[PDB]
Amino acid sequence: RYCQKWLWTCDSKRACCEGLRCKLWCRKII
């Protein structure tokens, strides 16, 4: 049970879970 490589460069097209609230690397569990 893990997220979806939140580490992506969150911005819009991203597909994070609960860490897309950032500029690039999803600021999730890290």
UniProtKB/Swiss-Prot annotation:
The lineage of its organism: Eukaryota, Metazoa, Ecdysozoa, Arthropoda, Chelicerata. The modification Isoleucine amide is found at I30. Its main location: secreted. One of its GO terms (molecular function) is sodium channel regulator activity. Belongs to the neurotoxin 30 (phrixotoxin) family. Negative results: does not inhibit Kv1.2/KCNA2, Kv1.3/KCNA3, and Kv1.4/KCNA4 channels. Shows an extremely weak inhibition on Kv4.1/KCND1. The chain holds residues 53 to 82 of 83 of the full protein. This is Beta/kappa-theraphotoxin-Cg2a. It comes from the Eukaryota. Keywords: Amidation, Disulfide bond, Ion channel impairing toxin, Knottin, Neurotoxin, Potassium channel impairing toxin, Secreted, Signal, Toxin, Voltage-gated potassium channel impairing toxin, Voltage-gated sodium channel impairing toxin. The presence of a 'disulfide through disulfide knot' structurally defines this protein as a knottin. It is found in: Secreted. Expressed by the venom gland. The keyword Methyltransferase does not apply. This gating-modifier toxin shows an important inhibitory activity on sodium channels. It is very active on Nav1.7/SCN9A (IC(50)~0.6 nM), and also shows activity on Nav1.3/SCN3A (IC(50)=292 nM), Nav1.4/SCN4A (IC(50)=2.2-159 nM), and Nav1.5/SCN5A (IC(50)=2.3-2.9 uM). It has also been shown to inhibit tetrodotoxin (TTX)-resistant (IC(50)=27.6 nM) and TTX-sensitive (IC(50)=30.2 nM) sodium channels in rat dorsal root ganglion neurons. Lower inhibitory activity has also been shown on potassium channels: Kv4.2/KCND2 (IC(50)=604.2 nM), Kv4.3/KCND3 (IC(50)=425.1 nM), and Kv2.1/KCNB1 (IC(50)=14.3 uM). Disulfide bonds join C3-C17, C10-C22, C16-C26. GO terms for cellular component: extracellular region.
